[PDB]
Design an enzyme around this catalytic site. Structure first.
Site, mmCIF file in Angstrom:
data_model
loop_
_atom_site.group_PDB
_atom_site.id
_atom_site.type_symbol
_atom_site.label_atom_id
_atom_site.label_comp_id
_atom_site.label_asym_id
_atom_site.label_seq_id
_atom_site.Cartn_x
_atom_site.Cartn_y
_atom_site.Cartn_z
ATOM 1 N N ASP A 122 0.953 -1.264 -0.135
ATOM 2 C CA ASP A 122 0.018 -0.090 0.101
ATOM 3 C C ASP A 122 0.924 1.208 0.139
ATOM 4 O O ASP A 122 1.351 1.634 1.168
ATOM 5 C CB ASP A 122 -0.915 0.008 1.325
ATOM 6 C CG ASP A 122 -1.801 1.433 1.197
ATOM 7 O OD1 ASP A 122 -1.826 1.993 0.169
ATOM 8 O OD2 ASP A 122 -2.443 1.425 2.221
ATOM 9 N N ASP A 123 1.206 1.685 -1.191
ATOM 10 C CA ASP A 123 1.842 2.958 -1.278
ATOM 11 C C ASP A 123 1.060 4.111 -0.714
ATOM 12 O O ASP A 123 0.664 5.026 -1.813
ATOM 13 C CB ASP A 123 2.344 3.300 -2.730
ATOM 14 C CG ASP A 123 3.290 4.410 -2.978
ATOM 15 O OD1 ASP A 123 3.943 4.647 -2.043
ATOM 16 O OD2 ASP A 123 3.211 5.053 -3.834
ATOM 17 N N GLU A 124 1.171 4.446 0.403
ATOM 18 C CA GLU A 124 0.314 5.374 0.896
ATOM 19 C C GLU A 124 1.029 5.994 2.320
ATOM 20 O O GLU A 124 1.586 5.136 3.042
ATOM 21 C CB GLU A 124 -0.980 4.854 1.512
ATOM 22 C CG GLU A 124 -1.947 5.862 2.177
ATOM 23 C CD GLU A 124 -3.435 5.178 2.448
ATOM 24 O OE1 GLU A 124 -3.550 4.072 2.319
ATOM 25 O OE2 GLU A 124 -4.371 6.031 2.633
ATOM 26 N N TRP A 125 0.938 7.140 2.444
ATOM 27 C CA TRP A 125 1.555 7.838 3.729
ATOM 28 C C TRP A 125 3.166 7.996 3.616
ATOM 29 O O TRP A 125 3.612 8.176 4.859
ATOM 30 C CB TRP A 125 1.074 7.417 4.990
ATOM 31 C CG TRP A 125 -0.313 7.650 5.198
ATOM 32 C CD1 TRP A 125 -1.275 8.397 4.689
ATOM 33 C CD2 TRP A 125 -1.118 6.937 6.141
ATOM 34 N NE1 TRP A 125 -2.513 8.262 5.187
ATOM 35 C CE2 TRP A 125 -2.606 7.501 6.113
ATOM 36 C CE3 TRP A 125 -0.899 5.969 7.159
ATOM 37 C CZ2 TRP A 125 -3.451 7.047 7.071
ATOM 38 C CZ3 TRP A 125 -1.705 5.475 7.857
ATOM 39 C CH2 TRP A 125 -3.165 6.193 7.861
#
Ligand SMILES: [Mg+2]
Length: 271
Positions: free
Chosen positions: A126-129
């Site tokens: 999950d390429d998030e944050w």
């Protein structure tokens, strides 16, 4: 390799927020004398830039589960569920998409080592944050995201890689052969599309929020559309310790022409 058409049935892929919920709850749902859920994602370990190093960081809850794999992971695996380590940014400025070559190899090695050490079945990205560019890391993409997928595939070719379809995933088309499934990142309504060139058979275009759940009928009708259109997965986000079988039984009816039952086991998070 296979020598026959070798179709794969629809897979149910669930993300557990392990800061809150004991992952054993994923095992409590039974369809056709097998677990309803096929993949469980322990959400999430983190990528952290620490100076020039790319590091894998496990928060106390993630680390507790890994350290207690015989208690909190292996019972799921015994019934055939594949347990994946989720990977998420952590506001350091370094993420999957802006690493240099050494960092990419370092991070891939750390992830493969964890998968081996803890007996996991693979990972979810999950390429998030990441907060790209904080603290001197590159503000933009270096192309490392695809290179990381390739490096991990080479290190663990028999393990699963899933991708939650958020962040720099548009870059991943050229490496999509190495990704088992992509999962739509918005909840409770399908989007009849895929990311990064994925075929329908390798994508979940519908992801149910099991905390803020839709009606069983909504899930039944949409899951029937997922199945009819030939998609290969359904996503589920934020399974809790309550009994949500009514919604899963809606999916069992709509996508699987079957039923789902609850085994009674509600597991508290006593850590
Ligand atoms: Mg959805």
């Amino acid at each position: 390799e296979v020598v026959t058409r070798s179709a794969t049935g629809i897979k149910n892929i669930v993300y557990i927020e392990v800061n809150d919920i004991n992952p054993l709850n994923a095992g409590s749902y039974i369809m056709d004398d097998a677990p309803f859920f096929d993949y469980v994602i322990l959400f999430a370990a983190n990528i952290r830039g620490v100076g020039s190093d790319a590091t894998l960081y496990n928060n106390p809850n993630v680390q507790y589960i890994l350290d207690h794999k015989d208690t909190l992971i292996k019972p799921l695996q015994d019934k055939g569920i594949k347990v994946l380590l989720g990977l998420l940014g952590d506001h350091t400025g370094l993420g999957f998409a802006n690493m240099n070559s050494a960092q990419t190899e370092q991070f891939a090695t750390a992830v493969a080592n964890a998968v081996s050490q803890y007996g996991l079945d693979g990972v979810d990205f999950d390429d998030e944050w990441a907060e790209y560019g904080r603290n001197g890391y590159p503000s933009g993409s270096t192309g490392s995201f695809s290179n990381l997928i390739t490096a991990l595939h080479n290190k663990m070719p028999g393990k699963t890689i899933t991708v939650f379809n958020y962040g720099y995933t548009s870059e991943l088309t050229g490496v999509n052969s190495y990704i088992d499934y992509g999962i739509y990142a918005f909840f409770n309504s399908p989007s009849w599309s895929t990311g990064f060139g994925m075929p329908n058979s390798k994508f979940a275009p519908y992801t149910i929020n099991l905390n803020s759940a839709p009606s069983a009928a909504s899930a039944q009708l949409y899951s029937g559309q997922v199945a009819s259109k030939g998609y290969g997965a359904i996503g589920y986000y934020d399974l809790r310790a309550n009994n949500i079988v009514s919604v899963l039984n809606g999916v069992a009816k709509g996508a699987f022409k079957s039923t789902c039952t609850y085994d009674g086991n509600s597991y508290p998070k006593n850590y």
